[PDB]
Amino acid sequence: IAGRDIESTGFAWWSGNARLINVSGKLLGAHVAHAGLMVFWAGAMVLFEVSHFVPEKPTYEQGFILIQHLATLGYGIGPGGEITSTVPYFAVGVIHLISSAILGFGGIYHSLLGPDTLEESFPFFGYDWRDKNKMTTILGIHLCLLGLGSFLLVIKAMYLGGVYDTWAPGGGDVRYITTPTLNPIVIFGYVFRSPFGGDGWVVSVNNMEDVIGGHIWVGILCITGGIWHIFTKPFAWARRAFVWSGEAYLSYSLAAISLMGFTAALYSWYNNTAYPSELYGPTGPEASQAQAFTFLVRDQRLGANVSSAQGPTGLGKYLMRSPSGEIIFGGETMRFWDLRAPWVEPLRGPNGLDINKIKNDIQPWQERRAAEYMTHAPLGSLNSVGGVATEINSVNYVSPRSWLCCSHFFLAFFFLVGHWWHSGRARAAAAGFEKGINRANEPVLSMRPID
């Protein structure tokens, strides 16, 4: 049991995977076995969702999160969010479930039986953590694979079937993206804009031509950055600034994956382009504009001239003006005036909502679309009671947007705590006082009196 108890490692059982820091072969097996777990869950969860699928309900009313990712890719999906087959969703889960046995075998092979260190007999795969040239090679190899995977989405959208475009003319449907936006001022205009309202940093991508053109650039950058890190060694300013240890590299990824987790959460909450509302339900902004649209249509049929109808406060009851001047929906939903849902954009001119198009040409599909979005707002309880916190127990519903955003906001915060844990520790373990203060030469004692 050498290296597997506290007397040889100095680590207890609860920090027991910290014994894997300097044994590269077992650390390899830990990562491919955990890779086998994520591929297992991807297979098992979407088979659960295929098995529990009913055709009468929309896919956001059934508590699903994974078949809407495949429907956005274009499988089994029809016009307007119609799910047609569920045989492509079954197949994706079988490939992911069968492949987890291969990753699960290579996990427990390299963990229990394979060589504990790769440096002696497999010099291409062996590494020291302090080898800055070898560590940029692993980073560069895995960067080219992320560029190749970003090009797979481009290949899927441009050549192999297309992706679901909720903005498509004729209704939302699967569409080949023929002209992706390659202009770097447009594409990096998402990366360098404000994160705040109206701007909405990277979440505010609003058409599929900017999505696929962004994944071309991400595919270009990751491949040219992968070849860059394979070929080169870190510059002298990089070598002065980082800690070159295994726990330090972990804490760099923990900070980066926490920033991505906060971003993917707000994708789920705000974006209705890559997360179409026919699949994920309406967004928070979308559902309250659907309410103001519903009672505008309700009261205009009763003969209200809704553009002149004064509210209780003196603002517009139905139509008011945004602080920039656009004609928006009135009420408390004036905060969500940046909402650009696909069922309300047919009524927008350059000045905001067009008044004659609201008076004359409001289509019955729009009144239906706003009606189910009003009644399936992302508001619900932990026991999945739909509605506000004062609602009674009859509706069994929580939006998938609310499940996706809350879980990944929970996870992204704790992974930022992991960045703080592991970067504080790796900085102190590199300097050599992570086990405590030396009694012989305490640093504060050899300092000036502090006053």
Partner: protein, 341 residues
């Protein structure tokens, strides 16, 4: 030798659970208070006192089960099982809320018996009785909330019931009817409790991050002996850290640990004073100068006056259900609503 001395020798014998003379009071009364609470939340209803389901027999979970207070009609009766309301009938005793006064009175003598236990053990171990002094905080909370607050009110009905969501009702009842957040004695209580949890976290993390290297393991828990004389952490480094981070640091370990005692106990004692005031409805309800200004100037709005409209909503929408003995029939036209809600 003497018969008192043989019993005093047997009660203070070092065994698995120390009994002592205080265990003659604590172990009966705390067992009946805990066991009476488990009996009420599992089996006993609130259908005749409050009109509620409050046991696991009726479908409540752990959050919504309670031992509810007696009916308002019995007043401040002790509700003895042999008393003039139940008259020995155990079933009728549980239905009028007799288990509430069972749990509250045997729980009151359990807290007396537990604080006497802290005095008794400290006298035998030979230390100072500061843990019994610190337990006066929780005793002052229980006495003032569960006993003194309903005694100043109309009946035991307005006491907190012994449940999770029943306590949550008591929190919102005292906002709507008493404006208890506005009370400066609750505010001193919030400062002592959040200040106590702060002092727990800072002192816990400062010791753990100013530890001395006393072993070679990265696991630093092994490098401590319970009988060692050296300090296990650097007070000079810990004082140096907080003097430059915060400007002010502790320099005395004795004053530090007394301060960890002082802050939450003062918070429980100051909040017990204001809840004795709410027993007599001597509440911090209104700032009259803002109420007089907002009466004659109908645009003067503060977050203060917005909170009074929330309280008038609470007092009208919950009063028919929360005081069912009173037969409050409010028509929908008299219930205060905002627009569209």
């Amino acid at each position: 030798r003497g018969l008192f001395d043989l019993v005093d020798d047997w009660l203070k014998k070092d065994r698995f659970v120390f009994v002592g003379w205080s265990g003659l009071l604590l172990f009966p009364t705390a067992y009946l208070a805990a066991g009476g609470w488990m009996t009420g939340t599992t089996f006993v209803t609130s259908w005749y006192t409050h009109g509620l389901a409050s046991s696991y027999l009726e479908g409540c979970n752990f959050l919504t089960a309670a031992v509810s207070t007696p009916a308002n009609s019995v007043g401040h009766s002790l509700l003895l099982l042999w008393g003039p309301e139940a008259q020995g009938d155990f079933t009728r005793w549980c239905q009028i809320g007799g288990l509430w006064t069972f749990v509250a009175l045997h729980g009151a003598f359990g807290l007396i018996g537990f604080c006497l236990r802290q005095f008794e053990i400290a006298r035998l171990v030979g230390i100072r009785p500061y843990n019994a002094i610190a337990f006066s905080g929780p005793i002052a909370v229980f006495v003032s909330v569960f006993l003194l607050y309903p005694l100043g009110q109309a009946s035991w009905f307005f006491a907190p019931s012994f449940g999770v969501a029943a306590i949550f009702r008591f929190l919102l009842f005292l906002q709507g009817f008493h404006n208890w957040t506005l009370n400066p004695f609750h505010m001193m209580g919030v400062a002592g409790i959040l200040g106590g949890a702060l002092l727990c976290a800072i002192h816990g993390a400062t010791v753990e991050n100013t530890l001395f290297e006393d072993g070679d393991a990265a696991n630093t828990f092994r490098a401590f002996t319970p009988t060692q004389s050296e300090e296990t952490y650097s007070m000079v480094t810990a004082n140096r850290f907080w003097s430059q981070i915060f400007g002010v640091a502790f320099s005395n370990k004795r004053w530090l640990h007394f301060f960890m005692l002082f802050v939450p106990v003062t918070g429980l004692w100051t909040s017990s004073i204001g809840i004795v005031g709410l027993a007599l409805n001597l509440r911090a309800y209104d700032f009259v100068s803002q109420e007089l200004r907002a009466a004659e100037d109908p645009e003067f709005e503060t977050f203060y006056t917005k909170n009074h409209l929330l309280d008038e909503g609470i007092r009208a929408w919950m009063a028919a259900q929360d005081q069912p003995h009173e037969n409050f029939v409010f028509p929908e036209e008299v219930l205060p609503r905002g627009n569209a809600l």
